[PDB]
Amino acid sequence: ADLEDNMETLNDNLKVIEKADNAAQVKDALTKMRAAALDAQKATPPKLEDKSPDSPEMWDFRHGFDHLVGHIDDALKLANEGKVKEAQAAAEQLKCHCNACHQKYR
């Protein structure tokens, strides 16, 4: 339930989505990723521990998860429609946003 746990949940469930057989597994994984992203959003990452909680870095860190959740919600709509392959493709759009936050704050 710490930041590192949230990241492990995000990473593990993206791989679940990639390997998924049906829409139910994609939806279940995305729902777990959604919770993890909103939990992570409340953390102070180690790199930013000396910054102000109101700093632009901390607000950029938090905003990154808002957009991640937006992408998760798009993939969730497709998974709820039974479109496994398009839900999976929508979920791959997450990866550039994982990487972008990591490049700044990992």
**Sequence ranges of the binding site for heme b:** 7, 102
Examine residue 76 and tell whether it contacts ligand HEC (CB under 6 A): no
Contacts with ligand HEC, 44-73, as mask; x by CB under 6 A: -xx--------------x--xx--x-----
User: Smallest Cα–Cα separation from 72: which of 98, 33, 102, 43?
Assistant: 33
Q: Give CA–CA dist 30/7, Å, rounded.
A: 13
Place of tokens 């959740």: 69
User: Which chain residues interact with ligand HEC by CB under 6 A?
Assistant: 3-4, 7-8, 10-11, 14, 45-46, 61, 64-65, 68, 94, 97-98, 101-102, 105-106
